[PDB]
Amino acid sequence: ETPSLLWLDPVFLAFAKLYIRDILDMKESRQVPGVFLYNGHPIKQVDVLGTVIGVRERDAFYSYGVDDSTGVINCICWKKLTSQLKKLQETIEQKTKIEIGDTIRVRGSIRTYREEREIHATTYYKVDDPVWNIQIARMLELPTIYRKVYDQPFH
């Protein structure tokens, strides 16, 4: 495999948005139990996006289970001049208040919740993507972002 000391790796410093099915299939490294391996390429806080099948009002987090027709994976979505601030929230409180029955993106840390590849949201937002408008370019770059480096060997 690839030791932790074998990671000048770019995404070892940056986020990533990878194949949820192969993210499931991403080798949970035995060097540190919980970093995902896309043929051996480590991330710090991965990115996912998809339709949400599950929503539970937990103590600190929504429970957003995203599938993008690639596969399921679940997200512990940690519950997220000043006069004109009256209107301020009125443009981001919307994109930070989601219900069930649409599409949502999540990014953030990786953890292992009893056989589930549990994402833990460091950043996310409500999206108007349920139409999958971005989806053309999104999953045209997704096979590309896979075939480019991470699935391939590191150099």
């Binding site: 339709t51 429970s63 599938d67 399921v72 029955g101 349920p130 139409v131 408008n133 096979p143």
Partner: protein
């Protein structure tokens, strides 16, 4: 919480080739929506014929309809009986404007990438 469903070709779903039962995501143009059981009638045609899948929402009670619009349902498409394909709308979203055949093209590219291991 539910299972995943890919995008099989939208004119092979309602015919009986893809294994039904398991979760699936499919689109279809609303023509005569049913409100009681929340039954959409998604159409299916790509220059071949007119197949049709059905949609029966389960989880969300407040979901309305729209005239002349495709709908994406992700959920349980069981092995529905004669002339029917019901996808239990545990995920229910709208489709309009977006170039959908190109979407299925990218989906086929994804299925191609599935092989590159």
């Amino acid at each position: 919480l539910p299972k995943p469903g890919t995008y099989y070709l939208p004119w092979e779903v309602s015919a009986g080739q893809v294994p039904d039962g398991s979760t699936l995501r499919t689109f279809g143009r609303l023509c005569l929506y049913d409100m009681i059981q929340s039954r959409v009638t998604l159409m299916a045609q790509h220059g071949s014929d007119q197949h049709q899948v059905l949609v029966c929402t389960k989880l969300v009670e407040p979901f309305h309809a729209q005239v002349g619009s495709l709908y994406i349902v992700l959920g349980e498409l069981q092995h529905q009986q004669d002339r029917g394909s019901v996808v239990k709308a545990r995920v229910l979203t709208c489709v309009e404007g977006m170039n959908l055949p190109l979407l299925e093209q990218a989906i086929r590219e994804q299925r191609l990438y599935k092989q590159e291991r």
